[PDB]
Design a protein around this motif. Sequence first.
Motif, PDB file in Angstrom:
ATOM      1  N   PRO A  40       0.827  -1.206   0.000  1.00  0.00           N
ATOM      2  CA  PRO A  40       0.000   0.000   0.000  1.00  0.00           C
ATOM      3  C   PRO A  40       0.859   1.252   0.000  1.00  0.00           C
ATOM      4  N   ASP A  41       0.310   2.318  -0.572  1.00  0.00           N
ATOM      5  CA  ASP A  41       0.996   3.601  -0.535  1.00  0.00           C
ATOM      6  C   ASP A  41       0.964   4.160   0.882  1.00  0.00           C
ATOM      7  N   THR A  42       2.127   4.591   1.373  1.00  0.00           N
ATOM      8  CA  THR A  42       2.234   5.021   2.764  1.00  0.00           C
ATOM      9  C   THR A  42       1.378   6.253   3.033  1.00  0.00           C
ATOM     10  N   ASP A  43       1.471   7.258   2.160  1.00  0.00           N
ATOM     11  CA  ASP A  43       0.779   8.520   2.404  1.00  0.00           C
ATOM     12  C   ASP A  43      -0.736   8.340   2.416  1.00  0.00           C
ATOM     13  N   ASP A  44      -1.262   7.493   1.529  1.00  0.00           N
ATOM     14  CA  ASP A  44      -2.701   7.251   1.519  1.00  0.00           C
ATOM     15  C   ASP A  44      -3.163   6.653   2.837  1.00  0.00           C
ATOM     16  N   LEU A  45      -2.412   5.689   3.367  1.00  0.00           N
ATOM     17  CA  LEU A  45      -2.744   5.156   4.680  1.00  0.00           C
ATOM     18  C   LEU A  45      -2.605   6.222   5.756  1.00  0.00           C
ATOM     19  N   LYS A  46      -1.678   7.164   5.577  1.00  0.00           N
ATOM     20  CA  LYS A  46      -1.546   8.257   6.536  1.00  0.00           C
ATOM     21  C   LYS A  46      -2.803   9.120   6.562  1.00  0.00           C
ATOM     22  N   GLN A  47      -3.341   9.464   5.388  1.00  0.00           N
ATOM     23  CA  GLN A  47      -4.591  10.225   5.380  1.00  0.00           C
ATOM     24  C   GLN A  47      -5.750   9.391   5.918  1.00  0.00           C
ATOM     25  N   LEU A  48      -5.768   8.091   5.620  1.00  0.00           N
ATOM     26  CA  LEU A  48      -6.866   7.255   6.090  1.00  0.00           C
ATOM     27  C   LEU A  48      -6.814   7.005   7.590  1.00  0.00           C
ATOM     28  N   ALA A  49      -5.645   7.145   8.215  1.00  0.00           N
ATOM     29  CA  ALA A  49      -5.526   6.829   9.634  1.00  0.00           C
ATOM     30  C   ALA A  49      -6.216   7.876  10.501  1.00  0.00           C
ATOM     31  N   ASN A  50      -6.007   9.154  10.197  1.00  0.00           N
ATOM     32  CA  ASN A  50      -6.523  10.233  11.028  1.00  0.00           C
ATOM     33  C   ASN A  50      -7.897  10.726  10.590  1.00  0.00           C
TER      34      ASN A  50
END
Lengths: 88, 107
Positions: free
Chosen positions: A78-88
């Motif tokens: 998975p793309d790291t940044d996309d998971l970063k936006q999805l986390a918060n």
Amino acid sequence: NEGFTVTAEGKGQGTLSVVTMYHAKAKDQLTCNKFDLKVTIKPAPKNTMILEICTRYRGDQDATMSILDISMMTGFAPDTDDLKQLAN
Amino acid sequence: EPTEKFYYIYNEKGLEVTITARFLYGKKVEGTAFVIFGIQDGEQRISLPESLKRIPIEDGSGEVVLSRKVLLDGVQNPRAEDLVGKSLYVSATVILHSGSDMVQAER
């Protein structure tokens, strides 16, 4: 399963019953019961594609807590940044 | 394993539940847990939708608290003495980070 003949004699009365247990064919079985799911996968506009999930609940009210288990293909991350936006 | 095998009615802190999950072969576990507190009155079971808490389990340990306000407001009756004589149950579901399987443990 075959036909049989009943022979009874003597005084008194008794209850005789026959119950057959069999595996019946299902009718209009829904493998996705209570959860209508729609996965859309599209190539992105290194090889990478944009992966999309569309989900819905078949109940009357909004569903309770749900889990989206994902097991991607071989050799994919998975793309790291996309998971970063999805986390918060 | 709750800290005390009861719930004081006037305890403003509220019920506290400790989850201790471990592998069968003596190794600790990592993952996420689900807790829901239900009130059992004999054969009648009443659930509390607002007590559902998603706690992360670390090194086979975790905690979750039910505030007394949630217990009071979950049942329609705001009376306190009526709750004496009833019982609570915890329905904990533990899920690995791998998503292999989940176990429903209930006390």
